[PDB]
Swiss-Prot record, chain A:
Signal peptide: none
Superkingdom: Eukaryota
TM ranges: none
Predominant subcellular localization, coarse grouping: cytoplasm
A GO MF label: structural constituent of ribosome
Protein's UniProt name: Small ribosomal subunit protein eS4A
From Swiss-Prot, chain B:
Subcellular location: Cytoplasm; Nucleus, Nucleolus
Family per similarity comment: Belongs to the universal ribosomal protein uS4 family.
Metal-binding recorded as keyword: no
Encoding gene, per UniProt annotation: RPS9A
Protein's recorded name: Small ribosomal subunit protein uS4A
BP GO annotations: maturation of SSU-rRNA from tricistronic rRNA transcript (SSU-rRNA, 5.8S rRNA, LSU-rRNA); ribosomal small subunit biogenesis; translation
Organism in which the protein naturally occurs: Saccharomyces cerevisiae (strain ATCC 204508 / S288c)
Subunit structure: Component of the small ribosomal subunit (SSU). Mature yeast ribosomes consist of a small (40S) and a large (60S) subunit. The 40S small subunit contains 1 molecule of ribosomal RNA (18S rRNA) and 33 different proteins (encoded by 57 genes). The large 60S subunit contains 3 rRNA molecules (25S, 5.8S and 5S rRNA) and 46 different proteins (encoded by 81 genes). Interacts with snoRNA U3. uS11 interacts with MPP10. Component of the ribosomal small subunit (SSU) processome composed of at least 40 protein subunits and snoRNA U3.
A GO CC term attached to the entry: small-subunit processome
Keyword Electron transport tagged: no
Part of the intact protein present: 2 to 124 of 197
Keywords: Cytoplasm, Isopeptide bond, Nucleus, Phosphoprotein, Ribonucleoprotein, Ribosomal protein, Ribosome biogenesis, RNA-binding, rRNA processing, rRNA-binding, Ubl conjugation
Top-level taxon in the UniProt lineage: Eukaryota
GO molecular function, a single term: structural constituent of ribosome
Anything else known: Present with 106000 molecules/cell in log phase SD medium. There are 2 genes for uS4 in yeast.
Curated annotation (Swiss-Prot), chain C:
Protein name as annotated: Small ribosomal subunit protein uS17A
Annotated crosslink Glycyl lysine isopeptide (Lys-Gly) (interchain with G-Cter in ubiquitin) location: 14, 45, 55-56, 78, 95, 104, 132, 140
Localization terms from the record: Cytoplasm
Entries under Pfam families matching the protein: Ribosomal_S17, Ribosomal_S17_N
Post-translational events: N-terminally acetylated by acetyltransferase NatA.
Keywords: Acetylation, Cytoplasm, Isopeptide bond, Ribonucleoprotein, Ribosomal protein, RNA-binding, rRNA-binding, Ubl conjugation
Organism annotation: Saccharomyces cerevisiae (strain ATCC 204508 / S288c) (Baker's yeast)
NCBIfam families the UniProt entry points to: PRK08572.1 (NF006345), uS17_arch (TIGR03630)
Subunit structure: Component of the small ribosomal subunit (SSU). Mature yeast ribosomes consist of a small (40S) and a large (60S) subunit. The 40S small subunit contains 1 molecule of ribosomal RNA (18S rRNA) and 33 different proteins (encoded by 57 genes). The large 60S subunit contains 3 rRNA molecules (25S, 5.8S and 5S rRNA) and 46 different proteins (encoded by 81 genes).
UniProt GO BP: maturation of SSU-rRNA from tricistronic rRNA transcript (SSU-rRNA, 5.8S rRNA, LSU-rRNA); ribosomal small subunit assembly; translation
Additional detail: There are 2 genes for uS17 in yeast.
From Swiss-Prot, chain D:
Post-translational modification Phosphoserine, affected residues: 65, 68, 72, 85, 142-143, 146, 149
PANTHER family reported in the protein's UniProt record: 40S RIBOSOMAL PROTEIN S8
More info: Present with 14400 molecules/cell in log phase SD medium.
Subunit structure: Component of the small ribosomal subunit (SSU). Mature yeast ribosomes consist of a small (40S) and a large (60S) subunit. The 40S small subunit contains 1 molecule of ribosomal RNA (18S rRNA) and 33 different proteins (encoded by 57 genes). The large 60S subunit contains 3 rRNA molecules (25S, 5.8S and 5S rRNA) and 46 different proteins (encoded by 81 genes).
Functional note: Component of the ribosome, a large ribonucleoprotein complex responsible for the synthesis of proteins in the cell. The small ribosomal subunit (SSU) binds messenger RNAs (mRNAs) and translates the encoded message by selecting cognate aminoacyl-transfer RNA (tRNA) molecules. The large subunit (LSU) contains the ribosomal catalytic site termed the peptidyl transferase center (PTC), which catalyzes the formation of peptide bonds, thereby polymerizing the amino acids delivered by tRNAs into a polypeptide chain.
Main location, first listed in the record: cytoplasm
Secreted is among the record's keywords: no
Gene expressing this chain: RPS8B
Residues recorded with modification Phosphothreonine: 61, 106
One cellular-component annotation, GO: 90S preribosome
Name assigned to this protein: Small ribosomal subunit protein eS8B
Subcellular location: Cytoplasm
Molecular function, one GO term: structural constituent of ribosome
RNA sequence: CUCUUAAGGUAGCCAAAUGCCUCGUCAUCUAAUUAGUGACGCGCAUGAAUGGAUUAACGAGAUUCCCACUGUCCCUAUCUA
RNA sequence: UCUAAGGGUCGGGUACGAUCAACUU
RNA sequence: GAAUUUGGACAAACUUGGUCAUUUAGAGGAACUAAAAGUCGUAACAAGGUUUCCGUAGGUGAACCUGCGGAAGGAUCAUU
RNA sequence: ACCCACUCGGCACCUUACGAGAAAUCAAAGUCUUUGGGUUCUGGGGGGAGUAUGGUCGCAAGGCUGAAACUUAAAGGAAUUG
RNA sequence: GUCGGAUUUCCAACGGGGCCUUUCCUUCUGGCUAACCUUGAGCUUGGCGAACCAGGACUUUUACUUUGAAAAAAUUAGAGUGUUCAAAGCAGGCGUAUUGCUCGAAUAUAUUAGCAUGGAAUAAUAGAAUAGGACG
RNA sequence: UAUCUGGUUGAUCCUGCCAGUAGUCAUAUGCUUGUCUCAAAGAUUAAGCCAUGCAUGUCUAAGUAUAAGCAAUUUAUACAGUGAAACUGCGAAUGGCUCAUUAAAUCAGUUAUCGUUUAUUUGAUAGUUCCUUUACUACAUGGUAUAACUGUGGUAAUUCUAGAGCUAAUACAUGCUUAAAAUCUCGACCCUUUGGAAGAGAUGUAUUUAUUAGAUAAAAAAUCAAUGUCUUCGGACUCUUUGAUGAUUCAUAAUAACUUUUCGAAUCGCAUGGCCUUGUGCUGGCGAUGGUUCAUUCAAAUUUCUGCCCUAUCAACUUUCGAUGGUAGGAUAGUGGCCUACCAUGGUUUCAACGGGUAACGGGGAAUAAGGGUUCGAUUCCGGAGAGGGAGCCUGAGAAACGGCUACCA
């Protein structure tokens, strides 16, 4: 009321941050940034609660004011900068590179990537229309705009961005039989080799999807991210590859080693 | 404003106040387990009940239901692990008929007596 | 309908930004603008070769059908360019394990391209608020 | 002040809605400008999100487009002559959108002679070669020639002076012109 | 219970235009009320076509209070024919 | 100082136009 | 460019009425419940000493009585 | 018009209790804890009370609709023995 | 057939799918032409489009029920785990503890309404009767 | 953990209620009280009234310091060290608290914005502005005022302020500085038919109006109006450029103009480098702040379908002066009877409208439960509303703000 809210209570933050209900009334409210608040890492959560690299928010604040942490190759000193899907976190100390990829469980899992891998990223194209002076542009899922794109790029494809220049090297067309990554939804964090899609004019287009173990699931079109042609993807998949093991037999795998 | 602290009572009272039958029996239970009051028995009755409420839930479900198999083995794993349930009885129907005191048998003060070294339960 | 003797209001009735130029001569003396509403609804022949204006018409006006698509039976057509339809449904009362009849009145704007009567079963499409209470627009007539 | 909410006037069933939610600024209105003619005076309005809005009063002149020739010029206004909404606006010579006005028609007359050169109402060879090419088009209509004799053209204000501070429009032609002339001359 | 009539005033109604005592008693209206109204009823001497009890409407009928208004008054003064 | 409404009479091969005059609101 | 000012809409608030709702006084009248070994009867329960009850109307200290029509919950399941 | 046999509908009746019920008793008052054919109306301890008030109908008598305060642990039904 | 864990040719049951028994239970512009009468010497040159696609005129309407997607977190049910037990909490656990390794923080419920999908029994609607009925 | 028991009679079997029985993130209270962990808490009546004290301020390398501040840099004579006050820029619209109002209202789930505003974050994004645009002219950069401060004073007092004298900018107000190219309008002449010219102007973005494009299932011929690029004037003829959505008058572009005219950097820190005709000559890095527009993010506004407690001793309500709809306009950030003018007579209801009550904020949820249910939800999260009652409004992207203002009542 009367204007935007600026706090975030605990028990309101998105559940995939794994924030314990006790230990403080409030939670870090992500600032405006390249990604939606609801699906957002922000760094005070990443550095302190996931990597255990800092014990308080004040040490997390100290690390950022050394210009060490850089997201997508830019410093981003802000403590609540919303880190989103498939941003690359590079730390000069320990020469460690991270990518934000949802685990099989739908949480932002710690995922170390090779230094060569941290040299590009993928973004799902959300809209492609003409800008001023008749200059076509695209919009990726992280708000990045790219002028003068390949005309063959259409909505729902994905593009490979250099991350040093705002340019694109490659794009994967959206077709049945392409490897995808479900972002958002009850099947969040699964990889599934599109089988087909339905039109359903009037909105909310669905797509059917089946993983390697021949398990079929369907999610909405906005919740699908093509990650390259079938077989090899263009990014290093985390451990597990999003298979969604049932609770029944996962324990046996858990009890396999002990 | 802080997250509310979950709490729950660990005991339930019997419906009818004065049974000669129930009054005698529970008093016997404290006799050979050295329990201070009736609350140490009501708790075991309450613990056993929420065991059966879950145990009854699984049985009425279809056999080979993924819920029953996973959870059913989970319950008998814990009951066996403590020692309340004998190893030879793992059918999830032998949980339904366990006993009142099998939990009281695995209490430390009882087990210390069993493992010598006390020569009386009140010791 | 009766073509409502189109030029009747105080202000001249015309389709906005649809200019006919008198310097040249050709067929189709008065240019007419129309569109297809999508969702499979067809543009009726009357709208194409009519003479009405009805700037709220979903085929020749400045309104767009988006959102819910409904269906009901016309119960009162005493308005002007508007009708009220009745939508019946059974509301399930959980305690008694059975249903009860209910109904609602949805005042919908009816285009001049359509002719409707009491008892006609019509489908309507949602659009931006047309009047104090009109939010749907007659888009297909299924009975006569 | 003037509020555009609807938690006032009655619900559809005729029931009266009780008071709720003391007036909000994002549901306001303001008062009409009622832009008159002459002695230009425009006041600025600070609207939502900044977005300055210009409120015309006592405006002088405007930009009117003669649609057929694809041109526009700056001309004056003689007065309001017909208003579909409220006849009271006519008597006070009040400028609103779609209020039929008479404009000065002076620049149009010289432009027509500059462009066509044949005649209206009633030197170097570089000129008439254009005129020879720009021929067969000096027969615009017989109902606008008669207006040029008096030097006033029936124009319609197609702009919102209350919002943009400007009175722009077009010159009535063809069917639209014949619609208002019969309304004007009826007696 | 008694004496006694042709029969012993019923339903109603009342200090009423009928109530002597009386300026009856209680309440209300009032600063203050022999006035008014509502109640009461052993009613000198109410009461049934001697018509009884009520009654909307109507009244140059009798009475009481209130608002508006006012030289009726406080308290007189001036003007015209 | 204006405005709206309220009429008569004449007119198409087998919707409109012209003329006149009312006090009522 | 201040004081001041014309007109407009928003409009608090007051005064005077009106309406509705809730509390509440009141001479007097008329009910209902309770206690107390009050006074008068004895209408009901037995064929309750005139069988009982219903509707209606009238009357009488009071329970009630009387007419007309009903019912049996009757004091008859019954007269080839 | 009678007699015999049969049938459709009605007014009833006689014996039985497989069944029902608290029981008197019921061929429906059965097919209801082995509880569901469709449907309308009514009831929720006894008094206050079918009262007050308000509507509405009536010439009136009165009808229909209809409380609350308060007070109480029993009122009641069917049979048994006296 | 390995020493209580699974395979095969199996006698059965349980439930699906395809074809035929008069059983179109809609289709064109073009692609894969596909499953290809395609056969080239026992792996070869060419069969009919949804088995996958853009637009097609049409398109009987419901109710129901299955599956699926959404239904904040806390709370409820509940998996794991030493808070000394427990109420709790989401921790921790293992190393030669010198340089470190590593699992978790599941799952379910979530009336009714809305959306997509399969069934078409049950309960309703309509169609070709002074035939503008369908094929042509 | 699918359980009942005492009370109508001399006794019996029923109807039926009274009593007991058990629980309560349901309160109070009585008697008693040793330990550990955990934790509600002036909500219920009074959304009654409040002494006092706190609860909103804020700086870096990076806007402005002659403190007549503090110490010494000493690399500095203008400054560059720290740094009160004050200007400027942000914030004070969050949080916190309460639950009075509120019964299709809020709210929950689900849609829409092809119906709008959005500070901020993130990503992109101005060669077109010497206006008679060859001396108008500063572009190695252009004016004004004021605070802080010095001094004089008033008042009993307020976070009161007057007059006088100074001084700054990322305060305020102005203001030029860079290529072309092409296009279209005008338009000197040869003079002519097939006609081209010298020369000039305009051509950013922003606002407003108008007009044009924003196609796109299939193949061939007839002669025309005249060739139409080049001709072997026979005609080979193609390139003919065109994005998205279910859908648009969409995106975007083109022509004509309009504007009282927006924006298009007179700003700051750090490191100082290369080029020579070594002149304070020409170029050069890393940042900070601001800035038009588009997109994203944080939002907001409005909006769809369905869903709410007791009431008929509430059966008709709405339309005087908006009730339901049409047209036009004004207003708004935008749709809309939101408002106004004209016109029509509509709109809801026995499927319960309207009116009344609520010891009613809605939900997520809570207690008790065999299954079904009943009752509660002021209160740890989400949503709304309020700041003693009403009303209006300034600043701002955002308030109908009240630890802002104005007025009225108390
Ligand atoms: Mg933040
Ligand atoms: Mg007696
Ligand atoms: Mg006696
Ligand atoms: Mg009797
Ligand atoms: Mg009886
Ligand atoms: Mg008979
Ligand atoms: Mg009861
Ligand atoms: Mg009762
Ligand atoms: Mg008896
Ligand atoms: Mg359905
Ligand atoms: Mg049915
Ligand atoms: Mg009894
Ligand atoms: Mg007795
Ligand atoms: Mg007894
Ligand atoms: Mg009780
Ligand atoms: Mg708040
Ligand atoms: Mg930015
Ligand atoms: Mg309108
Ligand atoms: Mg409008
Ligand atoms: Mg309340
Ligand atoms: Mg409350
Ligand atoms: Mg809250
Ligand atoms: Mg407020
Ligand atoms: Mg207060
Ligand atoms: Mg306020
Ligand atoms: Mg305060």
């Amino acid at each position: 009321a009367r204007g935007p809210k600026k706090h975030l209570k605990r028990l309101a933050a998105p559940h995939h941050w794994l924030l314990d209900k006790l230990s403080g009334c409030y939670a870090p409210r992500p600032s405006a940034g390249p990604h939606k608040l609801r699906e957002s890492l922000p760094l005070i959560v990443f550095l302190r609660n996931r990597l255990k690299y800092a014990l308080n928010g004040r040490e997390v604040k100290a690390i950022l004011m050394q210009r060490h942490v850089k997201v997508d190759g830019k410093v981003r000193t802000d403590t609540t900068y919303p880190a989103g899907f498939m941003d690359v976190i590079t730390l000069d100390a320990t020469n460690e590179n991270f990518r934000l990829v949802y685990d099989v469980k739908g949480r932002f899992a710690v995922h170390r990537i090779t230094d060569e891998e941290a040299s590009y990223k993928l973004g799902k194209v959300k809209k492609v229309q003409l800008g001023k002076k008749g200059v076509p542009y695209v919009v990726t899922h992280d708000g990045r705009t790219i002028r003068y794109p390949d005309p063959n790029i259409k909505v729902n494809d994905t593009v490979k961005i250099d991350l040093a220049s705002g340019k694109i090297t490659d794009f994967i067309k959206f077709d049945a039989g392409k490897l995808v990554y479900v972002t958002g939804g009850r099947n969040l964090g699964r990889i599934g080799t599109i089988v087909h899609k339905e039109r359903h004019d009037g909105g909310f287009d669905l797509v059917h999807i089946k993983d390697s173990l021949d398990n079929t699931f369907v999610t909405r079109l906005n919740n699908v991210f093509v990650i390259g042609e079938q077989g090899k993807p263009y990014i290093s998949l985390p451990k597990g590859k999003g298979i969604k093991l049932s609770i029944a037999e996962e324990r046996d795998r858990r009890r396999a080693q002990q | 404003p802080r997250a509310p602290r979950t709490y729950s009572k660990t005991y339930s009272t019997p419906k009818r106040p004065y049974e000669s039958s129930r009054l005698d029996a529970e008093l016997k239970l404290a006799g050979e387990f050295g329990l201070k009051n009736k609350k140490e028995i009501y708790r075991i009755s309450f613990q056993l009940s929420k065991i059966r409420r879950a145990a009854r839930d699984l049985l009425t479900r279809d056999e080979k239901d993924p819920k029953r198999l996973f959870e059913g083995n989970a319950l008998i794993r814990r009951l066996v692990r403590v020692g309340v349930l004998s190893e030879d009885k793992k059918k999830l129907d032998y949980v339904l008929a366990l006993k009142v005191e099998d939990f009281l048998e695995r209490r430390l003060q009882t087990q210390v007596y069993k493992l010598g070294l006390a020569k009386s339960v009140h010791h | 309908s009766t073509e409502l003797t189109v030029q009747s209001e105080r202000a001249f009735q015309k389709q906005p930004h649809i200019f006919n130029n008198p310097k040249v001569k050709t067929s189709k003396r008065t240019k007419r603008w129309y569109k297809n509403a999508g969702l499979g609804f067809k543009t009726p022949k009357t709208a194409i070769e009519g003479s009405y204006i009805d700037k709220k018409c979903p085929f020749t006006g400045l309104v767009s059908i988006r959102g819910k698509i409904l269906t009901g039976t016309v119960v009162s057509t005493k308005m002007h360019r508007t009708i009220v339809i009745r939508r019946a449904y059974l509301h399930y009362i959980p305690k008694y394990n059975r249903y009860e009849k209910r109904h609602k009145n949805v005042p919908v704007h009816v285009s001049p391209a359509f002719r409707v009567q009491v008892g006609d079963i019509v489908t309507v499409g949602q659009c931006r608020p047309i009047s104090k209470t009109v939010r749907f627009n007659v888009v297909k007539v299924s009975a006569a | 002040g003037i509020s555009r909410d609807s938690r006032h006037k009655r619900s559809a069933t005729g029931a009266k809605r009780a008071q709720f939610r003391k007036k909000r600024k994002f549901e306001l209105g303001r008062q009409p400008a009622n832009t008159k003619i002459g002695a230009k005076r425009i006041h600025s309005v600070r609207t939502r999100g900044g977005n300055k809005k210009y409120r015309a009063l006592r405006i002088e002149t405007g930009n009117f487009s003669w649609a057929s020739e694809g041109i526009s010029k700056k001309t004056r206004i003689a007065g309001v002559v017909y208003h579909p909404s409220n006849n009271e606006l006519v008597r006070t010579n009040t400028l609103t959108k779609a209020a039929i006005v008479q404009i000065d028609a002076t620049p149009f007359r010289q432009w027509f002679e500059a462009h066509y050169g044949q005649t209206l109402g009633k030197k170097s060879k570089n000129a008439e070669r254009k005129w020879a090419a720009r021929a067969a088009s000096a027969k615009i209509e017989s109902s606008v020639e008669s207006q040029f004799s008096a030097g006033r053209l029936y124009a319609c204000i197609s702009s919102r002076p209350g919002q943009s501070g400007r009175c722009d429009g077009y010159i009535l032609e063809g069917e639209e012109l014949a619609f208002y002339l019969r309304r004007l001359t009826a007696k």
